[PDB]
Amino acid sequence: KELSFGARAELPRIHPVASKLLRLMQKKETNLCLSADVSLARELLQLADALGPSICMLKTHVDILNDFTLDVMKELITLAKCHEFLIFEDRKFADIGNTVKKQYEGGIFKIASWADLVNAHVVPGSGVVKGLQEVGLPLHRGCLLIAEMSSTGSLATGDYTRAAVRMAEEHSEFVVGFISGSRVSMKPEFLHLTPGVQLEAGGDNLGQQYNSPQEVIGKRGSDIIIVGRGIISAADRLEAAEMYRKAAWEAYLSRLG
C-alpha cells in the first residue's frame, strides 16, 4: 500500500533532503520539477520567481548559462527559500571517483555549495557515488542515480537498471532516488523523478521521446515530473507550469486512493 508524500517524509530511513522535498511537495500540492533549460541568468531568475510557487524543484544545467556567476546562484537560493523548492544541478557525473569529487566541489561552478541535489550515471561503477559522497555528506546534500533514460536507443535498461538500484540501496546515506521512466525500486524511501514529459505526444529531432504526466505518474508509478520545453517554450510559462502541476498532482492523488 502507497503512502502520501507527507507520510513518506517521516519514514525511518528517509534522507533529510528527501524529507524536506516530500514535505514541501505535500504542503504546496506540487510534484513538478521545472527543467529551467535557458542560457540567460535573468530568464532563469524570472522563471524561478514566477514559477517558484508551482514547483517542488528547479533543475539547472549551469554549464549552459552564458552569464553564470556564483552571485546568480545566491539569488536563485533566495528564491528557492522564499518559494520553497529544491535546487537540482543536472550535472550527470559519470567519471571515476577521484575526478567527480573535484568536479562536484571545485572549479568555477562550486556545484556543491548551492545544489541541494545532483545526479550521476552508474556506468563507472560505485566509485562515482563514493567520490561524490566525500564532498556531499559533509554538506548534507543528496544524489539521484540515473536508472533509465527517456531517449531513443538508451542503454539504461535490464541489468544496467537493476545495477543502479543496487548502487542506490547500498549508498542510502547519500542517494535519495532515481532519474527513471518508471518506478524501479519498491522502497518508498526513494524518490522517482521522470523527464521526457509532455502533455501532447511527440519527441524532438535529437532522440527525445515524450510521455504524459498521467502515463508517467499514474500508470508507471513515478513521483515527480521533470518538464523543460513543455513549459519554457510556451508563451505563458506560469499557466503552462500550472497545467503540468495539476496533471501530475491529480495523477498522484488517483494512484494513492
Place this chain on the structure above:
Amino acid sequence: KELSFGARAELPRIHPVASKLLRLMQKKETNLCLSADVSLARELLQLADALGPSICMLKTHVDILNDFTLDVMKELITLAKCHEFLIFEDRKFADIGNTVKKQYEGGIFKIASWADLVNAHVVPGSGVVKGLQEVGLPLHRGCLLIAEMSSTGSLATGDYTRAAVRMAEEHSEFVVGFISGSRVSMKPEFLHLTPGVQLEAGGDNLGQQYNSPQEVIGKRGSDIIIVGRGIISAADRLEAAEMYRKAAWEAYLSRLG
C-alpha cells in the same frame, strides 16, 4: 596485419583530426596523452609547455580549473601549436542530444571553440552523438566514445561495449575512436585511448585500477595511454612523462614488427 601510425594517418576513411593526431604521434615518437588533472591555470600551462614535446595529446577537465578563463585556453592553444599536440576536453557528455549540443557550444566554457576532441558516454543512445555533431562537424572537431572504463564495478562491458562500437561505426564522420581498456574495434581508422595506466601495480581509494603501458598497448592492443597522477604526482614531471612516453612507444613498436 598492423599499420604504423604514419600509415593509419593516410587511410581512406580516416577523420581529419585523427590524421593530424596520427602524424604528430609518428613525427614525435609519442603515444602519451597527459591527463593534466590540476586546479591551477599556471600549473596547467607550465605542464603543457614543459611536457608538450613528450605528448601527443593534453587531456583537460576544465571544470576543475579554479581560475578558468577563455584566455587560459588561448594560451594552451598556443602551446598546443608550438609543441604539436591535440587538446582533449574530458567532458563525458552523457545527456540527451538537445542538451549536449548546448553544453558543447555554450555556457562559460565554450568547449567547442578550443577542444580538438571531446568524449561522450553512449548510455543516452545515439542522440548524444547526433547532438554533439551539430556543433562539432561545422567546427571540424572529433569525438571519442567511452566503450569501457578502468574503474571497479564499471558497467561498460559486454553488449554495452558492442553498442559503443556500433555507434562509432555509424557516426564515423565525427567519432574518431574510443576510450577503452583494450582494442574494441578491428577497424584501423579508429583510435583506442586507455586510461587507468601506471608503471607500478595498484589503484586508488575511490575505485581506480591501474595497468602498465606494456599490458595496455602491447598485450591489449590500445594505441595511446592516458596518465594523470603517475606523472602529475611525481617530483620531476618531465622525467615521468619521458618514462611513460618511452614505455608506450616501445610497446607500440614491439606489437608492430
